[PDB]
RNA sequence: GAAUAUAAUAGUGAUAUUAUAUUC
RNA sequence: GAAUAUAAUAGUGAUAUUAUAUUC
RNA sequence: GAAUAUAAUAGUGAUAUUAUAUUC
RNA sequence: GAAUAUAAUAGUGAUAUUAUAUUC
């Protein structure tokens, strides 16, 4: 079958004794086989006439499918029916029967959450063992923590019926916003309480075996300087001031910062509610200000990109923006702004092409890559950046740089927003990931971020963090990329806050390990008592925790102030989604075929819908097939709420914050 | 109901088994004639045998009316009455439906489609076919196709029994005959198309018929045109301002039809203008498109102004420029709209003065005033040529204080199937059921009704406002005023109209004379001549291109943007055309369809338009076809371009576009 | 076409929610339109790969012809084939194919009784909605009660397969020879049992409207 | 990454015809099966759904197919399951079949359950796919299944029967000595599987012969 | 334990013997 | 369409903005 | 989306353009 | 030709008679 490493057996030992356990071990030490061990033992412990039922939680589709495959192939020959349920296969199926007629079930926790809430799965007593992959996520309003809220509610209640053993796999329990050992210990105790765990399993007796399988990569800190001469920022700043002058001309903080972004966002939102007796003029003005603020925002983003990369990257970002402004129908003001950008475009591109105006950070990065690949041409590199724009920018920079000809950069990003033509699909991710190897097409992989450990990929002996700030958990997790001996990790940045934050994270790891060592010396009974104490406290707090405005409201377009609909026309589906009735609304919007047609709930996305008045094309929401009907689904964040009586205009980001008389959707209407 | 003698007379040839064309005035009650014929026909069969009748109505209202009447009438006699139309034609066993019913009311297109398919292998399944409005049995009309099947079986070696054929009409027509001989020729050809050997008309009971259906007295009103021409002056140099604008972009009698024809030709000529710079080609072509469109609208406005108020034309242009806005900002549209808005003041100053009035409207007002003064209980029906003129005259009536006694309603067609125009069937039914003596409406403005149609409230006053028609429509319209004292007024400013109506009267004379002459012939001889004409027409009918397999580009006719390639095009049911690939999905926007219908295996969901820089040019529709949600495009929305040569060609219809058409396959 | 009065929607509501229902409302309040509402909703509720089949029961030829005409003219537009079978058109015809190739079938109950008896219609599962005009007749040896005997025998018996929703239409359910409340409730419950009805729908929230439409005449006694 | 000859082999099946796909070993039958299953399952309208059953007569092939199908069809929202002798007993088989769109099955399971009555009819499936369909003969489990199928077909029953796809590299000719006897044998095999079409690669022979090469055979006496 | 297939060898064949492999 | 987490940035905090990622 | 008819205007005509109406 | 329902009158009732209406 397989040869179990001794430290794996050591980690699995408390769990095999039936104790609720949080297994904490280095990333890539083989958690799958520990899971298989604990599960196999758990199933094989039962006598004749009785069986066990294991559930395995993974909050990512790839890990879900991987673990499903592994568990199936491993266990069914033993005679245990293995299955899994995800969002794709959750609708119109008897979950109760599926759970009942199977011995090992792999879930995305939201499935169990929804089925518990719906009542289909009446109790967690049906399971005899629950395993949480990346159990550190069991906090706040996370699905894991919801499931555990159900568990703890049943536990601390007078409810009888047995409860399943709880195992939690992680590489770092975390310490939260701790400053010293005691705070960290309290946090870890809180996490153990959230998982009903009385044991923290770590490797102690087999450390030398573990340290030859999993090596800790050496970390280096690269502090560099920002570009000294920036005429680009001067030109873009002038364009910004001009746009501000136009905006101020219609109606009456350093550029390239996050503060100016927050400001211009606040300003746009504040402009969305500008009132005038003449409504056509109000429309023209609000649209004007919207366009101005949008262009200012784009200019700002460009300045940031230029700050973190080439000037060509920022200029191409702007060119792409103004290109998308075209093919969408020019407004008079859009024409003015496009002209104003076009006049400066020659000077901008001229300054951009100048090799003297290069970013020092890219030079230092190029130096690091050069040295490392010089010492070893077979180097496998992964490069983390904050934004997808910086991803594309850095791939373009690598492919464009003659000094880095030995590199064959690949892209790795999230799946993007569900209703936008961005990101990267899952099979595309898979495709690029299987091509990323020594005997593959890609040498270096440029990525944004990855939730937790995830699927193991080709080992990287070089990990570069390009202006990358994270927590202690993801810091410890990232080590899994370079498990081999001599693996190196650089942290390149031009601001001391990042390096200092990394140092803080390392100290937090020290506090974490020390706190774990301290907790492991406690008696299990005392620890269980403290756990029950924290659980009871949190349950009291949890158990402890507005009039609907029946007045008819107008939902207007945030860009045109055009009448989209009335709240009387709006109907709510399954207490979360919001559609509009009446054939009058049908002429208020246009539609484009959806870029990411997926089937969530009983809804099937067909198209996105936009405003139709005077080529506004502001995003209003989507258009879906819901059971028998073909209906539009709108988001409140696209509209201004004007009270018909008082005339007061308001903005709401989420429907749950919009407290009006919400009439349920009824087919009998 | 107890039969009138002329109905028994008209029915008698049919009841004797003769293939007959029944020709009698509108409103004499053809329904009960059909009921008599069907009843006798079905009841004539012995025990071991059974008859099967099929009734053809070419309109949904007539279809439903006849279905209901036949159902109520023949249910008690033991005969099952059913009906099939487009709404209930899909996914139903037509063969079983026909087989398990004795009387089937049918839209002819259903029978044509099922004959072409093979579900109904032969017309031998029927023993009696009845064509409502049998004068439509000509050319490529569904009736004529059905009869092509009939005659192909007859003249052919097929020994299978053919059904008796009855036609119903108030006028067989004479075509463009100049004399009695040519008229008789045409009528004989119609009798041949329907395989009729007898033409049934009232003879021995004319005195009875004339006391049920009275011929309304016709009056001819020739008035003077607009002597004034200030409005036309303004709009004219507006039009050569626009024409100069269009001329200042590329090289190379307003208010008339010739100018409309010409400007259509000009637009279609500008659509194929090419350049090295394709973007400037796009800009210039869009420019020319806009200019030509504005010129067209100005021309239309002039026509409206000559046939109605200047205010109506100005409101037409106002609505047009209102829809130019809310579609998007265009530099040129802003320019033109400005150029119009600057002269709006003078235009409305001219459209406000009361010295400005159309003598035609004043004469119409005089007629209405006199008639309603003589009789306030008058129920008027007013026919015009266009829906624009419908709305115009409605507004003119409701505006004029001297017509306060009028309660104007509207009656138009259903308009083009994929546009937000016209009027739905239940709306028509609503206004019509309101249009009565003691109803809500006194006068009903309308365009044209297909043949006779359902009987509406009797109109003792009919007015033809600039309205020409054939002899069939002239004879049929008399049904609107069957009561004695009914009057008709042909109001116009053209001698052409009057002359053509007089020509129509003479054609009616020729028709009746030719019929009466034909009714004297020996039936055997007539059957011989009919067989002769049928054989000749079949010989002619059975008379005697290679598809260009080279890939082509489909560009937008307005902005010359690339929609798709012919290689991406697939053909569904040998008629419809869809596009494959995710690329095309990025090329168009869509709006929910204004008239969602379930034609064929398709269900209309949306209209699709060009997406590039708010071009918004109609490309077609978006439909639900079985399991798939797919776009369907019309070729008349695109310019075809060859890859190699670079030629640009236009096609108004897909069947004229002889390229390599790949059948749509679900397995792709 | 017209437009539904509120109390008609109120009466139709339990039926549209799929409940077996006896609709009891004053004569002339407009029951045909209620029937049309229920039928339209019922037929339009099915997904693409499915279809409903409604049967309407009138025990009089005039009502039969009336309902046949109305339903035909109404549902022809929506693409639902409407037919009917009376005693005059029931012989030497394939009843099973007629029922199969139609979405709405108006029927004299005796036709269905005889065809269930012969076996030409093997089960009521072919229908998804049965409507009984004047449902109070569902008692003793009335054809309605025979049909519902078949229905109930399929329900309670080892017999399965889907049973059609059952609607009844009346102005009065009756109380039989009841002498008090309990006996009347006994009778009404037994009628609901005969029709397999779980809900009795009456006007409550829109009484004012109905009373403005349907007035109770003043009764005088002349000895 | 579908090859053209795979699409060619899958085309008759995708058109709803009962088909015996005959193609060289190693040309990639799994992907053809995946295309067929995918198209078949997606063809059904909203108010309906299909149910595929895949017969493998060996445990390794069973496991492999179950794995590939589960990994492939998970994203498409189709529940894939499997039943073998290792997980056959004390578990509601009918409930499993009902609660899954694709069922990978060793034929003896279906034989046992059909004869036991837990699966009342093959009408529960809309598509059956016999791996190595040349075994559909004599008293083989495949042939027993098809005996149930054909008994239902030729019987008075009006219940809908599933589409039938057979997969093989060789239909065989039995003890045929001439083309007529071989023709009769092959026709009999098609009758055993209710097949009306034999799918072979015709238009993409170049591609196929570039993917699969015929090894040279030497005779050593 | 039972069932199934293929090959060889006997018999006109049904079938049988062995080998090989598979399944419940 | 909605929900969730992490990070940065404002606020005493609740929370808010953006970025990033995940899920139904 | 497609098909059909009528009328007017161009052309010797096939036909073409627009208007109007109808149907699948 | 047959079946069904309601009402009145008889009978403890089953049921019967007539009237009335409906259906095949
Ligand atoms: Mg006009
Ligand atoms: Mg994160
Ligand atoms: Mg009675
Ligand atoms: Zn808008
Ligand atoms: Zn365009």
Structure tokens at C153: 């025998």
Round to the nearest angstrom and report the end-to-end CA distance of chain A.
Answer: 61
Do A472 and A430 have their domain in common? yes
Do B501 and B612 have their domain in common? no
Longest dimension (CA), chain B: 84
List residues in chain A touching B: CB distance below 8 A. 326-332, 335, 586-587, 590-593, 606-607, 612-615, 630
Q: How many whole angstroms separate alpha carbon B308 and alpha carbon B465?
A: 11
Nearest to A142, CA basis, from A59, A54, A86: A59
List residues in chain C touching A: CB distance below 8 A. 13, 16-17, 41, 44-47
Which of chain H's bases lie under 7 Å from a protein CB?
3-6, 22-24
The enclosing domain of C189 has a CATH number of: 3.40.50.300
Domain limits at A266? Answer: 229-358
Do A307 and A389 have their domain in common? no
DSSP assignment of C85-104? E-GGG-TTS-HHHHHHT-SE
Q: In 3-state terms, what secondary structure has residue A261?
A: helix
Nearest to A520, CA basis, from A2, A46, A14: A14
Do B334 and B369 have their domain in common? no
List residues in chain B touching C: CB distance below 8 A. 64, 67-68, 71-72, 75-80, 82-83, 85, 87-88, 90, 92-93, 96-97, 100, 425-426, 429-430, 598
Q: How many whole angstroms separate alpha carbon A337 and alpha carbon A295?
A: 8
CA distances from B519 to B137, B174, B199 (A): 21, 16, 7
Strands (E), A73-191: 82-85, 104-107, 129-133, 165-170
Do A105 and A195 have their domain in common? yes
Nearest to A59, CA basis, from A168, A200, A189, A153: A168
Round to the nearest angstrom and report the end-to-end CA distance of chain D.
Answer: 45
Q: Which residues of C touch D44 (CB under 8 A)?
A: 49
HSE (CB half, 13 Å, CA atoms) of B98?
Answer: 24
SS3 assignment for A364-419: HHHHHHHHHHHHCCCCCEEEECCCHHHHHHHHHHHHHCHHHCCCCCEEECCCCCCC
The pairing of strands D163-168 and D127-131 is parallel
Q: How many whole angstroms separate alpha carbon B341 and alpha carbon A466?
A: 59
B667 contacts D15? CB cut-off 8 A: yes
Q: Contact D137/D172 with Cβ under 8 angstroms?
A: no
Query: Dihedrals φ, ψ of D166, to 5°?
Result: -105, 145
Q: What are the binding residues of A for Zn(2+)?
A: 557, 560, 611, 616
The count of other CB atoms within 10 Å of the CB of residue C171 is 14
Structure tokens at B324: 């130019």
Q: In 3-state terms, what secondary structure has residue B282?
A: helix
Q: Contact D192/D19 with Cβ under 8 angstroms?
A: no
Residue A647, class by beta-carbon neighbours within 10 Å (0-12 exposed, 13-18 middle, 19+ buried)? exposed
Q: How many helices (H) and strands (E) does chain D have?
A: 8, 7
Q: In 3-state terms, what secondary structure has residue B314?
A: helix
Rg (CA), chain D: 18
Do B329 and B381 have their domain in common? no
D11 contacts B667? CB cut-off 8 A: yes
List residues in chain D touching B: CB distance below 8 A. 11, 14-15, 39, 42-45
Nearest to B36, CA basis, from B8, B77, B4, B64: B8
D95 contacts A101? CB cut-off 8 A: yes
Q: How was this structure determined?
A: X-ray
- Answer whether any strand F atom is within 7 A of the Cβ of A495: no
The enclosing domain of B668 has a CATH number of: 2.170.150.30
**Which residue in D has a C-alpha nearest to residue C52's C-alpha?**
D47
Do A418 and A470 have their domain in common? yes
C1' nearest to CA of D88: which nucleotide?
E24
- Answer whether any strand E atom is within 7 A of the Cβ of D64: no
Which residues in 363-402 of chain A line strand F, with CB less than 7 A from it?
386-389
Please, what sign has the CA dihedral across residues A190, A191, A193, A194?
A: positive
Structure tokens at A297: 């925002």
Structure tokens at A483: 């498990």
Nearest to C51, CA basis, from C147, C159, C129: C129
Any domain includes C221? no
The pairing of strands B638-642 and B552-556 is antiparallel
CA distances from C197 to B108, C22, C200 (A): 46, 6, 7
Q: How many whole angstroms separate alpha carbon D157 and alpha carbon A296?
A: 73
CA distances from B76 to B71, C59, C63 (A): 9, 15, 14
Q: Contact B581/B564 with Cβ under 8 angstroms?
A: yes
| Lateral strand order in the sheet of B380-383 | B217-222, B487-492, B461-465, B380-383, B443-446, B409-411
Considering every ligand atom, which ligand is closest to the CA of B610?
5
Q: Contact A167/A55 with Cβ under 8 angstroms?
A: no
Q: How many whole angstroms separate alpha carbon A124 and alpha carbon A121?
A: 7
Considering every ligand atom, which ligand is closest to the CA of A613?
4
Distance A255 CA to ligand 5 centre (A): 39
Distance B445 CA to ligand 1 centre (A): 16
Q: What is the resolution of this structure in A?
A: 2.6
Any domain includes C79? yes
Structure tokens at B4: 């009138």
Do A483 and A595 have their domain in common? no
CA distances from A316 to A260, A299, A336, A353, A390 (A): 21, 12, 20, 12, 12
Any domain includes D200? yes
Considering every ligand atom, which ligand is closest to the CA of C134?
3
Distance A555 CA to ligand 4 centre (A): 11
Structure tokens at C69: 């005409």
Any domain includes D219? no
- Answer whether any strand H atom is within 7 A of the Cβ of C61: yes
Do B434 and B505 have their domain in common? yes
B92 contacts C76? CB cut-off 8 A: no
Do A513 and A416 have their domain in common? yes
Which residues in 91-110 of chain D line strand E, with CB less than 7 A from it?
106-109
Buried b (16+ CB within 10 A) or exposed e, A464-499: bbbbbbbbbbbbbbbbbbbbeeebbbbbbbbeeebb
**CB contact set of A610 (below 8 Å; sequence gap of 6+):** A589, A590, A591, A592, A616, A617, A618, A619, A620
| Lateral strand order in the sheet of B20-23 | B81-84, B103-106, B53-56, B128-132, B164-169, B20-23, B198-200
**Which residue in B has a C-alpha nearest to residue D42's C-alpha?**
B627
**CB contact set of D203 (below 8 Å; sequence gap of 6+):** D4, D5, D8
Distance A605 CA to ligand 3 centre (A): 59
Do A205 and A120 have their domain in common? yes
Query: Among B505, B521, B537, which residue terminates a domain?
Result: B521
C touches which chains (3+ CB pairs under 8 A)?
A: A, B, D
Centroid of chain to Cα A444: 23
- Answer whether any strand F atom is within 7 A of the Cβ of A308: no
Q: Contact B108/B427 with Cβ under 8 angstroms?
A: no
Q: How many whole angstroms separate alpha carbon B87 and alpha carbon B249?
A: 50
Identify the residue whose tokens are 């052919």: B156
A touches which chains (3+ CB pairs under 8 A)?
A: B, C, D
Choose the closest CB to A628 out of C13, C17, C47: C47
| CA D14 / C1′ G2 distance in Å | 29
Give strand pairing partners of D131: D167
Do B281 and B365 have their domain in common? no
Query: Dihedrals φ, ψ of B602, to 5°?
Result: -110, 145
The pairing of strands B552-556 and B562-565 is antiparallel
B87 contacts C78? CB cut-off 8 A: yes
Identify the residue whose tokens are 């060009």: B610
Considering every ligand atom, which ligand is closest to the CA of B301?
1
Nearest to D201, CA basis, from D193, D210, D192: D210
Give strand pairing partners of B491: B221, B465
**CB contact set of A434 (below 8 Å; sequence gap of 6+):** A440
Q: How many whole angstroms separate alpha carbon A39 and alpha carbon A23?
A: 14
Q: How many whole angstroms separate alpha carbon A219 and alpha carbon A502?
A: 10
Helix (H) or strand (E) holding B488: strand B487-492
Q: Which residues of A touch C46 (CB under 8 A)?
A: 628
What is the number of structural domains in chain C? 1
Residues, chain A: 669
Q: How many whole angstroms separate alpha carbon A208 and alpha carbon A195?
A: 30
Q: In 3-state terms, what secondary structure has residue C212?
A: helix
Q: How many whole angstroms separate alpha carbon B384 and alpha carbon B307?
A: 10
The enclosing domain of A340 has a CATH number of: 1.20.1320.30
Q: How many whole angstroms separate alpha carbon B297 and alpha carbon D82?
A: 69
- Answer whether any strand H atom is within 7 A of the Cβ of C140: yes
Distance B303 CA to ligand 1 centre (A): 7
**CB contact set of B508 (below 8 Å; sequence gap of 6+):** B171, B471, B474, B475
């Amino acid at each position: 079958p397989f040869k179990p490493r001794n430290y794996q057996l050591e980690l699995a030992l408390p769990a095999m004794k039936g104790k609720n356990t949080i297994i904490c071990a280095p990333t890539g030490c083989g958690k799958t086989f520990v899971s298989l061990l604990i599960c196999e033992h758990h199933l094989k412990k039962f006598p004749q006439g009785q069986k066990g039922k294991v559930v395995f939680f993974a909050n990512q589709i790839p890990v879900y499918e991987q673990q499903k495959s592994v568990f199936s192939k491993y266990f069914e020959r033993h005679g245990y029916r293995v299955t899994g349920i995800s969002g794709a296969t959750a609708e119109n199926v008897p979950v109760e029967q599926i759970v009942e007629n199977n011995d090992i079930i792999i879930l995305t926790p939201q499935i169990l959450v929804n089925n518990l809430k719906k009542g289909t799965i009446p109790s967690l007593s049906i399971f005899t063992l629950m395993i949480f992959d990346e159990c550190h996520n069991t906090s706040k309003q996370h699905p894991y923590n919801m499931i555990m809220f159900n568990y703890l509610d049943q536990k601390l209640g007078g409810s009888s019926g047995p409860l399943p053993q709880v195992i939690g796999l992680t590489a770092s329990v975390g310490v939260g916003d701790a400053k010293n050992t005691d705070e960290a210990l309290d946090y870890i105790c809180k996490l153990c309480a959230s998982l009903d765990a009385s044991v923290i399993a770590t490797v102690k007796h087999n450390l030398e075996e573990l340290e030859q399988v999993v090596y800790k990569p050496q970390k280096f800190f690269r502090k560099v300087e920002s570009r000294i001469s920036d005429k680009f920022k001067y030109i873009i700043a002038q364009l910004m001031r001009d746009t501000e002058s136009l905006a101020k001309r219609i109606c009456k903080r350093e550029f390239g910062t996050q503060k100016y972004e927050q400001w211009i966002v606040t300003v746009q939102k504040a402009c969305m509610v500008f009132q005038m007796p003449d409504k056509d003029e109000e429309s023209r003005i609000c649209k004007a200000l919207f366009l101005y603020t949008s262009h200012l925002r784009k200019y700002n983003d460009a300045l940031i990109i230029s700050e973190h990369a080439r000037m060509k990257d920022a200029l191409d970002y702007l060119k792409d923006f103004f290109s998308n402004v075209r093919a969408a129908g020019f407004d008079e003001i859009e024409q003015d702004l496009t002209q104003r950008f076009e006049e400066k475009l020659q000077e901008l591109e001229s300054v951009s092409r100048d090799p003297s105006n290069e970013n020092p950070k890219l030079e230092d990065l190029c130096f690091i890559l050069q040295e490392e690949y010089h010492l070893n041409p077979e180097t496998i590199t992964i490069l983390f950046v904050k934004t997808r724009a910086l991803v594309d920018a850095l791939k373009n920079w690598i492919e464009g740089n003659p000094k880095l000809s030995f590199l064959k950069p690949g892209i790795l990003t999230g799946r993007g927003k569900t209703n936008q033509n961005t990101g990267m699909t899952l099979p595309a991710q898979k495709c690029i990931l299987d091509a990323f190897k020594a005997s593959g097409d890609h040498n270096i992989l440029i990525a944004t971020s990855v939730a937790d450990e995830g699927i193991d990929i080709a080992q990287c002996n070089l990990v570069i963090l390009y202006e990358y700030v994270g927590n202690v958990i993801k810091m410890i997790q990232t080590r899994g990329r370079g498990r081999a001996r001599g693996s190196k990790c650089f942290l390149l940045t031009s601001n001391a806050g990042v390096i200092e934050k990394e140092q803080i994270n390392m100290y937090k790891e020290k506090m974490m390990n020390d706190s774990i060592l301290r907790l492991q010396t406690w008696d299990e009974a005392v620890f269980r008592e403290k756990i029950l104490h924290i659980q009871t406290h949190e349950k009291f707090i949890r158990d402890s925790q507005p009039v609907p405005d029946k007045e008819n409201k107008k939902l207007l377009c945030r860009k045109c102030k055009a009448l989209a609909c009335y709240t009387a026309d709006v109907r709510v589906i399954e207490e979360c989604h919001y559609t509009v009735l009446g054939d009058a609304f049908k002429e208020c919007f246009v539609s484009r075929p959806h870029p990411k047609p997926k089937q969530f709930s009983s809804f099937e996305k067909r198209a996105k819908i936009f405003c139709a008045r005077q080529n506004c094309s502001h995003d209003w929401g989507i258009h879906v097939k819901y059971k028998t009907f073909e209906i539009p689904v709108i988001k409140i964040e696209s509209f201004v709420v004007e009270d018909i009586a008082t005339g007061v205009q308001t903005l709401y980001s989420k429907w749950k914050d919009f407290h009006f008389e919400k009439i349920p959707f009824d087919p009998a209407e």
